Design a protein around this ligand. Sequence first.
Ligand SMILES: *CC(=O)[C@H](CCCCN)NS(=O)(=O)c1ccc(C)cc1
Length: 212
Amino acid sequence: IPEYVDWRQKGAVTPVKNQGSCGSCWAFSAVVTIEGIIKIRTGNLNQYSEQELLDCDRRSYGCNGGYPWSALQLVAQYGIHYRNTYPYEGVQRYCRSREKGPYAAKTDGVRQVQPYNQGALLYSIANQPVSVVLQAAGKDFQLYRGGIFVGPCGNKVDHAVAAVGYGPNYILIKNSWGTGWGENGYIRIKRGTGNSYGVCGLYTSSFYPVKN
Ligand SMILES: *CC(=O)[C@H](CCCCN)NS(=O)(=O)c1ccc(C)cc1
């Protein structure tokens, strides 16, 4: 369980993206999750469509609300297309999955990490990236243009992102905003403080598919 875990230089995460004026934190977080695992075994890095997840997942409320843990489940159940055969537009619409044709990616299950346990988060993040939530409605996290976020912030979780590494002290997160935020679309939050919930409630509820 290395002292350092970066999947970027591991060839697991692709360039950064933006959800835009679409409240669709959840579908993006997912595509990265599934994505990671998909490349971890096969040795093939891919960019899947979040747009599809939006238009297809009726359980989620597309362009403004969702469950990073429906998306995944969805995929495993059905599947998910490339981000070319289903590029992101930013507006929820009619499911094209079927109309689009044969799927391209399809997992083999979804599991959740025991909330409120850093030790647990890491491990999984060590075996493969994960979808995690937190407080973004933040007025500080909103302004982050590079650094180690300690706060201030709260325990009112409401935005989903992704963890793509950690250090002895900083946890790495991929944001669904442009590369005109944090440190090039990236933000480092601090771990090991005692805060069980985890600063910004980053330890509330996390997840991930399964792959054979
Ligand atoms: C996570 C997400 O999509 C939310 C909106 C949820 C709304 C539920 N009522 N917004 S966001 O945090 O991604 C966001 C998007 C655009 C901007 C300018 C700020 C934040």
